Amino acid sequence: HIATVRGLAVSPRHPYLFSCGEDKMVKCWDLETNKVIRHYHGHLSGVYALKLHPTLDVLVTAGRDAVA
RNA sequence: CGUCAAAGCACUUUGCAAAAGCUAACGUAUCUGUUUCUUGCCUUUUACCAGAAACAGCCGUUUGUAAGGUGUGCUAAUUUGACUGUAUAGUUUUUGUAAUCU
Ligand SMILES: [Mg+2]
Protein backbone atom coordinates (compact mmCIF):
# COMPACT_ATOMS: atom_id res chain seq x y z
CA HIS A 1 0.00 0.00 0.00
CA ILE A 2 1.17 3.51 -0.81
CA ALA A 3 -0.80 5.33 1.90
CA THR A 4 -2.68 4.51 5.10
CA VAL A 5 -4.77 1.34 5.11
CA ARG A 6 -8.34 2.05 6.19
CA GLY A 7 -10.30 -1.18 5.80
CA LEU A 8 -9.81 -4.95 5.79
CA ALA A 9 -12.11 -7.88 5.21
CA VAL A 10 -11.35 -11.59 5.27
CA SER A 11 -13.77 -13.38 2.98
CA PRO A 12 -15.45 -16.29 4.81
CA ARG A 13 -16.09 -18.14 1.55
CA HIS A 14 -12.85 -17.42 -0.35
CA PRO A 15 -9.22 -17.56 0.78
CA TYR A 16 -8.93 -13.83 0.10
CA LEU A 17 -8.22 -10.67 2.07
CA PHE A 18 -9.46 -7.39 0.64
CA SER A 19 -7.93 -4.10 1.74
CA CYS A 20 -8.46 -0.44 0.95
CA GLY A 21 -6.53 2.69 1.70
CA GLU A 22 -6.24 6.42 1.27
CA ASP A 23 -4.11 5.69 -1.79
CA LYS A 24 -7.37 5.15 -3.75
CA MET A 25 -6.91 1.49 -4.73
CA VAL A 26 -8.60 -1.63 -3.40
CA LYS A 27 -6.52 -4.80 -3.37
CA CYS A 28 -7.40 -8.50 -3.22
CA TRP A 29 -4.71 -10.50 -1.45
CA ASP A 30 -4.64 -14.21 -2.22
CA LEU A 31 -4.00 -15.72 1.19
CA GLU A 32 -2.84 -18.97 -0.40
CA THR A 33 0.15 -17.15 -1.93
CA ASN A 34 0.22 -13.87 0.08
CA LYS A 35 0.22 -11.85 -3.13
CA VAL A 36 -2.06 -9.22 -4.63
CA ILE A 37 -4.08 -10.62 -7.53
CA ARG A 38 -6.97 -8.20 -8.19
CA HIS A 39 -7.14 -4.42 -8.34
CA TYR A 40 -10.35 -2.41 -8.24
CA HIS A 41 -9.68 1.01 -9.64
CA GLY A 42 -12.53 3.49 -9.88
CA HIS A 43 -12.28 5.89 -6.90
CA LEU A 44 -11.63 9.59 -7.14
CA SER A 45 -10.19 9.87 -3.63
CA GLY A 46 -9.31 7.87 -0.55
CA VAL A 47 -11.37 4.87 0.51
CA TYR A 48 -12.52 4.72 4.12
CA ALA A 49 -14.51 1.50 4.49
CA LEU A 50 -14.73 -1.95 2.98
CA LYS A 51 -17.39 -4.60 3.47
CA LEU A 52 -18.14 -7.93 1.84
CA HIS A 53 -21.58 -9.24 0.98
CA PRO A 54 -22.29 -12.38 3.04
CA THR A 55 -23.87 -14.32 0.17
CA LEU A 56 -22.91 -12.86 -3.20
CA ASP A 57 -19.42 -12.65 -4.67
CA VAL A 58 -19.49 -8.87 -4.41
CA LEU A 59 -17.88 -6.25 -2.18
CA VAL A 60 -18.71 -2.65 -1.33
CA THR A 61 -16.26 0.18 -0.68
CA ALA A 62 -17.05 3.75 0.33
CA GLY A 63 -14.77 6.74 0.37
CA ARG A 64 -14.13 10.47 0.27
CA ASP A 65 -15.73 10.89 -3.16
CA ALA A 66 -19.14 10.80 -1.42
CA VAL A 67 -19.91 7.59 -3.30
CA ALA A 68 -20.19 3.95 -2.27
C1' C B 1 -11.74 -62.28 -48.81
C1' G B 2 -17.02 -64.13 -47.23
C1' U B 3 -22.01 -63.50 -44.59
C1' C B 4 -25.22 -60.09 -42.10
C1' A B 5 -26.82 -55.23 -40.70
C1' A B 6 -27.58 -49.48 -41.74
C1' A B 7 -25.65 -45.40 -43.99
C1' G B 8 -26.14 -42.85 -50.21
C1' C B 9 -20.95 -42.06 -50.89
C1' A B 10 -16.31 -38.96 -52.07
C1' C B 11 -14.52 -34.00 -51.71
C1' U B 12 -15.83 -29.38 -49.42
C1' U B 13 -18.17 -24.42 -46.70
C1' U B 14 -20.12 -22.59 -42.26
C1' G B 15 -22.32 -22.84 -37.24
C1' C B 16 -22.34 -25.18 -32.23
C1' A B 17 -19.71 -28.07 -28.35
C1' A B 18 -15.62 -30.44 -26.33
C1' A B 19 -10.22 -31.73 -26.00
C1' A B 20 -4.28 -34.80 -19.80
C1' G B 21 -6.94 -39.07 -15.29
C1' C B 22 -3.60 -43.88 -15.30
C1' U B 23 2.82 -38.25 -15.79
C1' A B 24 1.63 -36.38 -20.40
C1' A B 25 4.22 -33.75 -27.81
C1' C B 26 -4.03 -30.84 -28.46
C1' G B 27 1.57 -27.48 -31.41
C1' U B 28 8.36 -32.91 -32.52
C1' A B 29 6.40 -25.50 -33.76
C1' U B 30 6.68 -21.01 -30.84
C1' C B 31 5.39 -15.10 -30.02
C1' U B 32 3.15 -11.06 -26.94
C1' G B 33 0.83 -8.66 -22.81
C1' U B 34 -0.94 -7.62 -17.34
C1' U B 35 -0.23 -7.95 -11.95
C1' U B 36 3.07 -9.00 -7.70
C1' C B 37 8.37 -9.67 -6.46
C1' U B 38 13.89 -9.72 -7.30
C1' U B 39 17.49 -7.51 -10.66
C1' G B 40 20.36 -4.36 -14.80
C1' C B 41 21.18 0.45 -16.92
C1' C B 42 19.94 4.49 -14.67
C1' U B 43 18.52 12.44 -13.68
C1' U B 44 12.45 11.92 -14.48
C1' U B 45 8.27 9.07 -17.46
C1' U B 46 7.44 5.91 -21.76
C1' A B 47 10.49 2.52 -24.13
C1' C B 48 13.74 -0.69 -21.57
C1' C B 49 17.32 -5.17 -19.02
C1' A B 50 16.52 -10.78 -17.32
C1' G B 51 14.89 -14.30 -13.84
C1' A B 52 10.48 -16.15 -10.90
C1' A B 53 5.17 -16.74 -9.60
C1' A B 54 0.03 -16.11 -10.80
C1' C B 55 -2.82 -14.90 -14.83
C1' A B 56 -4.49 -13.70 -19.82
C1' G B 57 -4.15 -12.79 -25.44
C1' C B 58 -2.88 -14.11 -30.39
C1' C B 59 -1.11 -17.62 -34.59
C1' G B 60 -2.51 -22.73 -35.16
C1' U B 61 -4.22 -28.28 -34.39
C1' U B 62 -7.79 -32.55 -33.37
C1' U B 63 -12.58 -34.74 -32.57
C1' G B 64 -17.91 -34.88 -32.25
C1' U B 65 -22.23 -32.95 -34.20
C1' A B 66 -25.97 -29.78 -37.30
C1' A B 67 -27.18 -27.47 -41.84
C1' G B 68 -25.55 -26.79 -46.76
C1' G B 69 -22.26 -26.72 -51.70
C1' U B 70 -19.79 -29.43 -55.89
C1' G B 71 -19.26 -34.37 -58.65
C1' U B 72 -21.31 -38.58 -59.14
C1' G B 73 -25.63 -42.58 -57.59
C1' C B 74 -30.16 -44.37 -56.24
C1' U B 75 -32.56 -49.18 -62.90
C1' A B 76 -26.36 -48.88 -57.46
C1' A B 77 -21.80 -46.76 -55.73
C1' U B 78 -19.12 -46.36 -51.48
C1' U B 79 -18.24 -46.27 -46.47
C1' U B 80 -18.68 -47.71 -41.27
C1' G B 81 -19.58 -51.59 -37.83
C1' A B 82 -20.51 -56.52 -36.34
C1' C B 83 -19.63 -61.90 -37.09
C1' U B 84 -19.08 -68.96 -32.89
C1' G B 85 -16.57 -67.83 -41.24
C1' U B 86 -15.08 -72.73 -45.38
C1' A B 87 -14.59 -77.72 -47.27
C1' U B 88 -15.43 -83.17 -46.42
C1' A B 89 -20.68 -90.30 -46.59
C1' G B 90 -14.47 -94.02 -46.36
C1' U B 91 -12.04 -95.04 -38.02
C1' U B 92 -12.06 -88.82 -33.33
C1' U B 93 -18.71 -85.99 -33.65
C1' U B 94 -23.53 -84.52 -39.04
C1' U B 95 -25.10 -89.31 -44.43
C1' G B 96 -25.86 -94.43 -38.56
C1' U B 97 -23.70 -101.74 -35.75
C1' A B 98 -28.64 -101.42 -37.17
C1' A B 99 -33.11 -103.56 -35.94
C1' U B 100 -34.66 -107.98 -32.94
C1' C B 101 -36.40 -108.79 -27.03
C1' U B 102 -35.96 -107.30 -21.97
MG1 LIG C 1 8.29 15.98 -14.13
PDB file of C-alpha atoms in Angstrom, chain A residues 12-37:
ATOM      1  CA  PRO A  12     -15.446 -16.288   4.811  1.00  0.00           C
ATOM      2  CA  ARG A  13     -16.094 -18.139   1.548  1.00  0.00           C
ATOM      3  CA  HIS A  14     -12.851 -17.421  -0.351  1.00  0.00           C
ATOM      4  CA  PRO A  15      -9.221 -17.560   0.785  1.00  0.00           C
ATOM      5  CA  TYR A  16      -8.930 -13.825   0.101  1.00  0.00           C
ATOM      6  CA  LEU A  17      -8.221 -10.669   2.067  1.00  0.00           C
ATOM      7  CA  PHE A  18      -9.456  -7.387   0.642  1.00  0.00           C
ATOM      8  CA  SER A  19      -7.931  -4.104   1.740  1.00  0.00           C
ATOM      9  CA  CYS A  20      -8.465  -0.440   0.955  1.00  0.00           C
ATOM     10  CA  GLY A  21      -6.530   2.690   1.700  1.00  0.00           C
ATOM     11  CA  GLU A  22      -6.235   6.420   1.270  1.00  0.00           C
ATOM     12  CA  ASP A  23      -4.112   5.686  -1.794  1.00  0.00           C
ATOM     13  CA  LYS A  24      -7.370   5.147  -3.749  1.00  0.00           C
ATOM     14  CA  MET A  25      -6.907   1.489  -4.725  1.00  0.00           C
ATOM     15  CA  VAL A  26      -8.597  -1.632  -3.400  1.00  0.00           C
ATOM     16  CA  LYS A  27      -6.520  -4.804  -3.369  1.00  0.00           C
ATOM     17  CA  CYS A  28      -7.395  -8.500  -3.222  1.00  0.00           C
ATOM     18  CA  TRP A  29      -4.708 -10.501  -1.449  1.00  0.00           C
ATOM     19  CA  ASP A  30      -4.642 -14.205  -2.218  1.00  0.00           C
ATOM     20  CA  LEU A  31      -3.997 -15.715   1.187  1.00  0.00           C
ATOM     21  CA  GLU A  32      -2.838 -18.971  -0.400  1.00  0.00           C
ATOM     22  CA  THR A  33       0.146 -17.147  -1.933  1.00  0.00           C
ATOM     23  CA  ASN A  34       0.217 -13.874   0.082  1.00  0.00           C
ATOM     24  CA  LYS A  35       0.216 -11.852  -3.134  1.00  0.00           C
ATOM     25  CA  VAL A  36      -2.062  -9.220  -4.632  1.00  0.00           C
ATOM     26  CA  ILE A  37      -4.081 -10.621  -7.532  1.00  0.00           C
TER      27      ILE A  37
END
